[PDB]
C-alpha cells in the first residue's frame, strides 16, 4: 500500500532472457506453425474465429520496440499463440500437435528462467 512496499525483485535481466527464450522458441523444429501472422486472406475462418492473431514474429517485434510493459504481459502473447492454434486445430493434426509440443517446451524454459 502506500508506502509499502514488498522487497524489489531484480526485472532488469528480464527483457534480455525474454528474448532468449524467444529465439530458442523461433528455432524449434516444430516452430514452423508460428513464425509468421496467419494470412487472413488466404484461411477461412481464421479472420472471425480468432479474435486475437498472435505469432512469433508479430511477438519479436513488440518486445524489440518496448510494447512489453513486464515479463507477464510477454508470456500472455506467447500463451495466445498455443491458445488460438487449439482453438483452430484438432489436437490430432500436425499443427495441432505442434502447437502442444511448443507451449510444453515454453512452459519449462518459463519455470526454469524465472520461479
Not at 519479436?60 to 518496448?66: A, N, Q, T
Not at 511448443?102 to 524454459?109: A, G, Q, S
Request: glycine share 4%.
Amino acid at each position: 500500500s502506500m508506502s509499502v512496499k514488498k522487497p524489489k525483485r531484480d526485472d532488469s535481466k528480464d527483457l534480455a532472457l525474454c528474448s532468449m527464450i524467444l529465439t530458442e522458441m523461433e528455432t524449434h523444429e516444430d516452430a514452423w506453425p508460428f513464425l509468421l501472422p496467419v494470412n487472413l486472406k488466404l484461411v477461412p475462418g481464421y479472420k472471425k474465429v480468432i479474435k486475437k492473431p498472435m505469432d512469433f514474429s508479430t511477438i519479436r517485434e513488440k518486445l524489440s520496440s518496448g510494447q512489453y510493459p513486464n515479463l507477464e504481459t510477454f508470456a500472455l502473447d506467447v500463451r495466445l499463440v498455443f491458445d488460438n492454434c487449439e482453438t483452430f486445430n484438432e489436437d490430432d493434426s500436425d499443427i495441432g500437435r505442434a502447437g502442444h509440443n511448443m507451449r510444453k517446451y515454453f512452459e519449462k524454459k518459463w519455470t526454469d528462467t524465472f520461479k
